[PDB]
Amino acid sequence: GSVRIAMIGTGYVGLVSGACFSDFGHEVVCVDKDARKIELLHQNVMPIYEPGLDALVASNVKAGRLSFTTDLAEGVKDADAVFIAVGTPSRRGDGHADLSYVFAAAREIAENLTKPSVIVTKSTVPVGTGDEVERIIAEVAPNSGAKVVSNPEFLREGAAIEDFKRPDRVVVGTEDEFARQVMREIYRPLSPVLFTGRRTSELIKYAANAFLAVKITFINEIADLCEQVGADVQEVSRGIGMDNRIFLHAGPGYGGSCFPKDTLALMKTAADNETPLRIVEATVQVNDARKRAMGRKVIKAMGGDVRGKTVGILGLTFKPNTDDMRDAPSLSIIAALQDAGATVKAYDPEGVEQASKMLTDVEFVENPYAAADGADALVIVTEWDAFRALDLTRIKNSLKSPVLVDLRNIYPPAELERAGLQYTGVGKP
Amino acid sequence: GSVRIAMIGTGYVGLVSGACFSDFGHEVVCVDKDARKIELLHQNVMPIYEPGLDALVASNVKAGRLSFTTDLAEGVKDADAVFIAVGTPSRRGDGHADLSYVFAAAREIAENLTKPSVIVTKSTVPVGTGDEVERIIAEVAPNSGAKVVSNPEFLREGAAIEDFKRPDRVVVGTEDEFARQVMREIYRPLSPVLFTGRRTSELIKYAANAFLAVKITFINEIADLCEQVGADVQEVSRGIGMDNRIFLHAGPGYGGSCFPKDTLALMKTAADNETPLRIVEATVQVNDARKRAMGRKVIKAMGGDVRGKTVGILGLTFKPNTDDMRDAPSLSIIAALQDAGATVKAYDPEGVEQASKMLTDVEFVENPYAAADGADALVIVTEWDAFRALDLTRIKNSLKSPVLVDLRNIYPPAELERAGLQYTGVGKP
Numbered sequence: 001g002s003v004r005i006a007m008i009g010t011g012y013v014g015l016v017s018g019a020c021f022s023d024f025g026h027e028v029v030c031v032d033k034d035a036r037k038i039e040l041l042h043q044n045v046m047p048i049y050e051p052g053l054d055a056l057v058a059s060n061v062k063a064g065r066l067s068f069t070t071d072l073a074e075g076v077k078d079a080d081a082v083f084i085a086v087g088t089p090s091r092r093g094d095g096h097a098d099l100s101y102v103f104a105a106a107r108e109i110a111e112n113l114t115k116p117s118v119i120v121t122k123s124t125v126p127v128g129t130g131d132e133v134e135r136i137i138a139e140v141a142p143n144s145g146a147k148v149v150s151n152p153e154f155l156r157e158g159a160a161i162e163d164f165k166r167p168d169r170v171v172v173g174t175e176d177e178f179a180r181q182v183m184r185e186i187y188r189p190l191s192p193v194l195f196t197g198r199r200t201s202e203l204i205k206y207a208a209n210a211f212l213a214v215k216i217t218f219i220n221e222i223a224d225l226c227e228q229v230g231a232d233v234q235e236v237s238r239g240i241g242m243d244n245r246i247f248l249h250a251g252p253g254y255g256g257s258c259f260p261k262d263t264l265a266l267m268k269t270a271a272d273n274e275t276p277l278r279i280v281e282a283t284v285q286v287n288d289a290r291k292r293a294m295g296r297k298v299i300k301a302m303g304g305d306v307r308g309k310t311v312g313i314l315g316l317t318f319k320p321n322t323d324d325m326r327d328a329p330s331l332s333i334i335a336a337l338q339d340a341g342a343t344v345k346a347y348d349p350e351g352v353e354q355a356s357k358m359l360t361d362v363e364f365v366e367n368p369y370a371a372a373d374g375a376d377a378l379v380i381v382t383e384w385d386a387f388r389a390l391d392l393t394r395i396k397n398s399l400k401s402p403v404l405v406d407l408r409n410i411y412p413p414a415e416l417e418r419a420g421l422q423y424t425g426v427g428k429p
Numbered sequence: 430g431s432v433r434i435a436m437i438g439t440g441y442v443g444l445v446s447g448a449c450f451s452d453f454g455h456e457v458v459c460v461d462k463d464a465r466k467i468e469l470l471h472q473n474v475m476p477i478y479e480p481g482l483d484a485l486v487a488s489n490v491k492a493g494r495l496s497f498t499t500d501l502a503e504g505v506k507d508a509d510a511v512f513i514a515v516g517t518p519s520r521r522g523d524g525h526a527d528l529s530y531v532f533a534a535a536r537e538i539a540e541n542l543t544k545p546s547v548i549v550t551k552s553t554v555p556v557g558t559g560d561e562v563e564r565i566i567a568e569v570a571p572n573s574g575a576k577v578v579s580n581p582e583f584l585r586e587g588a589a590i591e592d593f594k595r596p597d598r599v600v601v602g603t604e605d606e607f608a609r610q611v612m613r614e615i616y617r618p619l620s621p622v623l624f625t626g627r628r629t630s631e632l633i634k635y636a637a638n639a640f641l642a643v644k645i646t647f648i649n650e651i652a653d654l655c656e657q658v659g660a661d662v663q664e665v666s667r668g669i670g671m672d673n674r675i676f677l678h679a680g681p682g683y684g685g686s687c688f689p690k691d692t693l694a695l696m697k698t699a700a701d702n703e704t705p706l707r708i709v710e711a712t713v714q715v716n717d718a719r720k721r722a723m724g725r726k727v728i729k730a731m732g733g734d735v736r737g738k739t740v741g742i743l744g745l746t747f748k749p750n751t752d753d754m755r756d757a758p759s760l761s762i763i764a765a766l767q768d769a770g771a772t773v774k775a776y777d778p779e780g781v782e783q784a785s786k787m788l789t790d791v792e793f794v795e796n797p798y799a800a801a802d803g804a805d806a807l808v809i810v811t812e813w814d815a816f817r818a819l820d821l822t823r824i825k826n827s828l829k830s831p832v833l834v835d836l837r838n839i840y841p842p843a844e845l846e847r848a849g850l851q852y853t854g855v856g857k858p
């Protein structure tokens with residue numbers, strides 16, 4: 001077994017996917033036309049933060065199953081199966097899926113093509129893309145015997161290895177049993193693998209990523225109500241959570257590289273295919289408005305007048321245990337506070353150098369305790385678990401006003417009562 | 430232990446709750462101011478269809494822990510705890526919760542009150558109702574030492590006993606440890622019991638019943654999309670289903686006594702308390718429009734012109750294994766077909782005599798095979814499991830046109846291909 005694999009793309013996915021494939025004993029080549037990543041991996045410095053990846057590559061480098069390039073064709077040289085892990089960002093303008101990078105890459109594959117390889121769209125793409133590639137293959141390399149599949153990916157950033165190593169499931173969309181037997185032979189070192197049709201499998205990744213955002217934004221909307229009637233959303237989430245058709249926690253919304261656009265593309269692709277998707281249509285419309293309003297929640301907690309005051313922020317990314325600030329909630333929360341004339345200390349363990357390019361006018365620090373140092377208030381945004389065990393009593397002495405806004409509901413309010421702090425969570429009496 | 434219990438109300442809930450309480454060995458009195466129910470239970474004829482209830486009452490009648498009346502006070506005579514299981518239907522007009530029946534009953538309790546009993550709202554009520562009762566108690570019987578609780582109920586009709594006997598969870602909302610110890614002492618024969626505050630516990634039943642409707646209407650919206658792009662929603666539901674944060678199946682919508690109004694009251698109660706609930710606000714708006722459109726799905730399948738043709742219906746209720754036609758999908762599906770001038774055979778095993786009062790102009794039958802007999806098409810609506818094993822080949826010979834519309838996706842299309850039938854499910858290529 002132990003076969004030849006080309007991962008076109010070496011970003012957050014293509015790296016982690018291809019690396020784990022090498023741990024299965026497969027012959028793996030990761031490609032990226034950015035040089036800096038490849039000229040960082042060859043230096044054995046990972047570009048991004050994912051736990052476990054530090055060893056996982058550097059290991060399989062040495063055992064010699066894992067290779068890096070920027071030359072496409074070196075990878076596509078006799079590869080058994082070729083994976084496409086390139087970006088599918090939102091098209092500036094409408095919101096639809098920028099499939100150009102794929103369509104560029106799928107083409108550049110099709111020419112540099114020795115054997116009847118197997119083409120795997122792993123990128124979160126809209127539906128019938130695999131049909132459209134199937135034209136391009138036939139357009140470029142007609143008699144090359146190649147087959148086109150979709151196998152989407154479901155990993156959470158910050159748990160990518162374990163998500164990949166232990167999947168709930170994995171999805172494969174084709175009808176040609178040859179390619180079915182191949183993708184079987186690939187994924188065989190785990191022992192389930194779900195075999196649907198192509199367009200079905202393309203639809204699932206969107207449908208799931210939509211549905212999670214629905215679940216999050218639902219309880220968030222509930223959490224707003226829990227405030228005004230004096231309920232307690234942690235109990236409520238547990239209240240429905242013990243159902244077998246439910247594990248969900250209130251927040252200032254969702255974000256990340258994957259989520260908020262995949263909604264939007266699905267919302268769009270539904271529109272072109274002439275069906276409404278009202279629930280998901282509502283879902284972003286709350287969510288965009290939500291994280292902004294979470295900023296107004298702070299101002300209300302801070303009396304109402306935040307002209308010229310000073311605000312500490314804990315956490316910056318949309319998610320602990322990575323650096324992916326791409327569509328964080330926090331930017332919207334900051335920009336709200338700036339718009340009412342204020343000033344912004346901000347700590348993130350590993351987000352900063354990526355966060356700086358998205359952020360105007362923001363004093364970053366070195367330390368979470370320093371973020372509160374002479375602020376009018378401190379906001380917790382992202383639950384890096386280091387925050388979960390901190391000294392509350394330093395902070396009361398570190399503040400110009402004893403005002404704390406938990407937004408991931410970590411700290412039990414008795415502690416903030418004990419340290420005499422102004423408690424403000426999400427969904428609280 | 431084995432204590433005195435009064436269940437004010439003896440409808441779909443109050444019966445099944447109180448009966449199961451008697452099986453715990455508690456002294457149980459069920460009250461209803463309708464006579465006919467009480468003058469049916471005394472004849473040992475259950476009014477409604479619930480599996481297991483036939484024996485469960487008739488048993489505990491004989492062992493003498495279970496009693497019936499229409500006199501309220503006979504039940505409230507020295508009762509340890511008093512349950513309110515009366516109706517909370519939608520207020521004709523706005524849509525809000527008709528809390529008059531409660532407010533009538535809670536009052537009539539408060540006067541006929543010997544001991545410091547314990548008042549339990551079990552009816553699906555809006556929030557702070559338990560606070561409003563707490564006034565009425567204090568208004569009427571101030572020094573009577575009584576406490577007011579909410580313990581909502583979560584059973585599905587058609588599985589009520591097993592739902593009650595094996596709960597995922599049970600909810601209790603108060604802060605007075607006396608009443609906490611009582612409701613403990615009640616529910617102790619199971620061995621969890623969830624103890625929240627009052628308003629929180631009132632909110633949960635709505636939040637859950639909202640959230641399920643969201644889940645159903647979500648995949649339904651997805652199922653519409655699966656049609657137009659040729660996906661396969663059974664695989665898709667399974668595709669997301671293997672997530673641990675998911676077991677959901679496409680339909681023509683939801684209904685029943687409990688669901689579609691509890692949405693609406695929650696939507697309303699949120700409005701009075703000045704927060705929007707956009708997702709649930711979207712959820713009904715699809716759902717009302719959906720089941721009607723499912724009727725138009727039939728017409729499209731039936732060519733488009735259904736003036737003067739004839740249509741068979743399988744299933745009528747919103748749910749197999751009960752008779753509760755109250756807000757079925759089917760009525761909307763029928764009325765759509767009637768509005769394009771057609772004619773309607775309809776079989777339901779146990780819905781009919783209740784269904785007749787909601788339905789104009791509808792030839793009911795005795796038998797599912799007779800519903801198709803010389804129709805232009807047959808529609809399956811409700812999955813009574815008797816339908817799951819039927820002869821398809823009689824039906825092709827029983828039809829003026831070989832047209833079948835599965836709407837709960839039970840029959841695998843190969844069978845309908847085998848019997849040469851016009852296959853039409855929900856979310857199909």
Ligand SMILES: NC(=O)c1ccc[n+]([C@@H]2O[C@H](COP(=O)([O-])OP(=O)(O)OC[C@H]3O[C@@H](n4cnc5c(N)ncnc54)[C@H](O)[C@@H]3O)[C@@H](O)[C@H]2O)c1
Pocket residue numbers: 008009010011012013014031032033034037085086087088089101102104105122123124125153154155156157257258
């Ligand atoms: N980030 C996630 O959490 C996640 C999870 C599941 C699926 N996905 C999907 O996977 C895809 C990529 O994810 P990502 O986070 O790593 O995006 P990314 O921007 O971080 O990485 C994509 C990389 O592919 C490279 N690339 C683009 N075109 C190329 C080409 N023609 N040839 C060689 N290399 C090329 C880029 O240099 C880039 O570094 C997206 O479609 C995304 O939706 C992402």
Ligand SMILES: NC(=O)c1ccc[n+]([C@@H]2O[C@H](COP(=O)([O-])OP(=O)(O)OC[C@H]3O[C@@H](n4cnc5c(N)ncnc54)[C@H](O)[C@@H]3O)[C@@H](O)[C@H]2O)c1
Pocket residue numbers: 437438439440441442443460461462463466514515516517518530531533534551552553554582583584585586686687
């Ligand atoms: N039907 C369900 O599936 C379900 C599930 C969970 C919760 N609930 C909730 O429980 C409540 C009742 O449910 P239901 O289906 O049995 O309604 P129901 O109309 O079928 O039964 C209510 C009964 O209570 C009786 N009643 C009304 N006022 C009374 C009074 N003042 N004194 C004595 N008896 C009185 C009525 O005669 C009626 O038969 C509702 O609030 C409902 O939302 C229903």
